[PDB]
Design an enzyme around this catalytic site. Structure first.
Site, PDB file in Angstrom:
ATOM      1  N   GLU A  35       0.853  -1.011   0.127  1.00 32.12           N
ATOM      2  CA  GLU A  35      -0.113  -0.112  -0.048  1.00 32.12           C
ATOM      3  C   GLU A  35       1.068   1.300  -0.007  1.00 32.12           C
ATOM      4  O   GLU A  35       0.759   2.297  -0.624  1.00 32.12           O
ATOM      5  CB  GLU A  35      -1.052  -0.053   1.383  1.00 32.12           C
ATOM      6  N   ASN A  46      -7.674   9.394  -5.635  1.00 28.37           N
ATOM      7  CA  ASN A  46      -8.468   8.283  -6.207  1.00 28.37           C
ATOM      8  C   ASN A  46      -9.318   9.099  -7.359  1.00 28.37           C
ATOM      9  O   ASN A  46      -9.718  10.286  -7.496  1.00 28.37           O
ATOM     10  CB  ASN A  46      -9.464   7.654  -5.240  1.00 28.37           C
ATOM     11  N   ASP A  48     -12.202   9.291  -8.006  1.00 27.18           N
ATOM     12  CA  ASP A  48     -13.406   9.910  -7.375  1.00 27.18           C
ATOM     13  C   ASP A  48     -13.141  11.205  -6.549  1.00 27.18           C
ATOM     14  O   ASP A  48     -14.038  11.996  -6.304  1.00 27.18           O
ATOM     15  CB  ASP A  48     -14.310   9.046  -6.727  1.00 27.18           C
ATOM     16  N   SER A  50     -11.404  11.521  -3.735  1.00 23.08           N
ATOM     17  CA  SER A  50     -10.998  11.187  -2.456  1.00 23.08           C
ATOM     18  C   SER A  50      -9.504  10.919  -2.414  1.00 23.08           C
ATOM     19  O   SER A  50      -8.778  10.943  -3.669  1.00 23.08           O
ATOM     20  CB  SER A  50     -11.729  10.031  -1.926  1.00 23.08           C
ATOM     21  N   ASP A  52      -6.108   8.800  -0.444  1.00 24.56           N
ATOM     22  CA  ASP A  52      -5.528   7.656   0.525  1.00 24.56           C
ATOM     23  C   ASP A  52      -4.347   8.202   1.232  1.00 24.56           C
ATOM     24  O   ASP A  52      -3.327   8.788   0.540  1.00 24.56           O
ATOM     25  CB  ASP A  52      -5.287   6.143  -0.232  1.00 24.56           C
ATOM     26  N   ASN A  59      -8.534   5.683   3.365  1.00 22.20           N
ATOM     27  CA  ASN A  59      -9.184   6.420   2.197  1.00 22.20           C
ATOM     28  C   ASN A  59     -10.279   7.510   2.889  1.00 22.20           C
ATOM     29  O   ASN A  59     -10.973   7.411   3.785  1.00 22.20           O
ATOM     30  CB  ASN A  59     -10.226   5.465   1.420  1.00 22.20           C
TER      31      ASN A  59
END
Ligand code: BR
Ligand code: BR
Ligand code: BR
Ligand code: BR
Ligand code: BR
Ligand code: BR
Ligand code: BR
Ligand code: NA
Length: 129
Positions: A35, A46, A48, A50, A52, A59
């Site tokens: 990750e 992301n 959309d 958002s 991380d 998130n």
């Protein structure tokens, strides 16, 4: 901070993440590896809108607040920047909540595609724990 492998294992264990919800310590170290490559300051946008954050790439859509993800939730009740600190306490406490929500570690796409069903014990081999 960029953690070493056994250093992160020891911190995760001290904070009680080992065997949490049935997931051995190796699963958590493997997840962090793919990750964030063990980097607490990691961020990724992301599609959309958002973002991380941190060593376990938590998130902002659901779990923390960053003031630029309109319509999102803050289920761990923390600023997303808290997930970027050298101290992993906030990331661990938030991860304990995510893994408890029904889908286990499948929440971490990198874990599912790269850790699940593999020899995850390999990630803590050699460490003094
Ligand atoms: Br393990
Ligand atoms: Br990679
Ligand atoms: Br941001
Ligand atoms: Br927001
Ligand atoms: Br922005
Ligand atoms: Br720590
Ligand atoms: Br599970
Ligand atoms: Na949020």
């Amino acid at each position: 901070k960029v953690f070493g492998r056994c250093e992160l294992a020891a911190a995760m264990k001290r904070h009680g993440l080992d065997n949490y919800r049935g997931y051995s310590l190796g699963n958590w170290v493997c997840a962090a590896k793919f990750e964030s490559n063990f980097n607490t300051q990691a961020t990724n946008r992301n599609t959309d809108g958002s973002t991380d954050y941190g060593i376990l790439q938590i998130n902002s859509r659901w779990w923390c607040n960053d003031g630029r993800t309109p319509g999102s939730r803050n289920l761990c009740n923390i600023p997303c920047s808290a997930l970027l600190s050298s101290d992993i306490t906030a990331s661990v406490n938030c991860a304990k909540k995510i893994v408890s929500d029904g889908n286990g570690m499948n929440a971490w796409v990198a874990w599912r595609n790269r850790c699940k069903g593999t020899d995850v014990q390999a990630w803590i081999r050699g460490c003094r724990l």
